[PDB]
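Exercise 7. Predict the joint structure of the components listed below.
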Amino acid sequence: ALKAEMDQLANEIDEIGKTTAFGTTKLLAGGFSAGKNFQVGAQDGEDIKVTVKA
Amino acid sequence: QVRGLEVGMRNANDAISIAQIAEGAMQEQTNMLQRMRDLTVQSENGANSSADLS
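Solution:
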């Protein structure tokens, strides 16, 4: 009984891992493992990198 | 001399007209280039997808 509940909790951890999105792009699956840049200034090269691992 | 100066002022006003038309045309070109600059800065956003880029 204890282990059956452990398995259900691990399944929900996996579901949250694969389901989280910004619209249609996945966030916790490994697509941001090497970060993406957002240009936060007016000139080229003035930008910040956002990194999320799986 | 008097008659030639009269005709010469007419030619000078013709030149001013030409320059004024061309100079006024270049302003809309500047305006559209500023708009394209904003679109290019907006393309540098790690939340855009291929449809937004298109």
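Discussion. The longest strand of chain A covers residues 36-39.
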